[PDB]
Amino acid sequence: ADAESLFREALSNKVDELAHFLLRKYRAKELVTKAEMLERVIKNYKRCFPVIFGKASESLKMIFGIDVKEVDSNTYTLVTCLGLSYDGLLQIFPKTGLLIIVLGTIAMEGDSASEEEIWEELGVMGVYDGREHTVYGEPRKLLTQDWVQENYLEYRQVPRYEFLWGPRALAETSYVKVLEHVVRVNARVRIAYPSLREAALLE
């Protein structure tokens, strides 16, 4: 009921309304300009663009592995992170960012990571064997079936189970390119929502 309390609910909802807008833009393979997002998403809170865009771009790079690339002006185009070819749209929710998360988890346990170690990373993010996550789908089936035939992963016995990078994963990115995407994002500038006094000062 409080105004500043209803403010961050409006910002948090414009973050999820811009993100779900850009996903509609990436699926159509169009270009996005700053004028479009102002007029057709955050028409009311335009001067908040550096923070709703910054918190939506960051909510794409890491959730769906989609990168907002400014062509440089004020024009942006949507591509996949580390330049992969798979997203999972066959056009709702890209599964690229979860792939890139699984890859970097093996990249840190060495050549191969145990099935146990993989699930434990996936369990902390709300994705559980035998539970259809809404955005990602069934995890066990998508990890095993989907990414084995796509040649992104390997799944073999003990000599327990384990995961290794596949031929297509090594062809489109590297251990060093993933481990630096993890470092660049772990060292990002963290955006904080503005108060009402702050947001009004910028005018």
Binding site: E58, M62, I101, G104, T105, E121, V124, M125, G126, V182, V185, N186, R188
Partner: peptide
């Protein structure tokens, strides 16, 4: 929660 990049 993703414990790769803390977000």
């Amino acid at each position: 929660y993703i414990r790769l990049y803390d977000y």
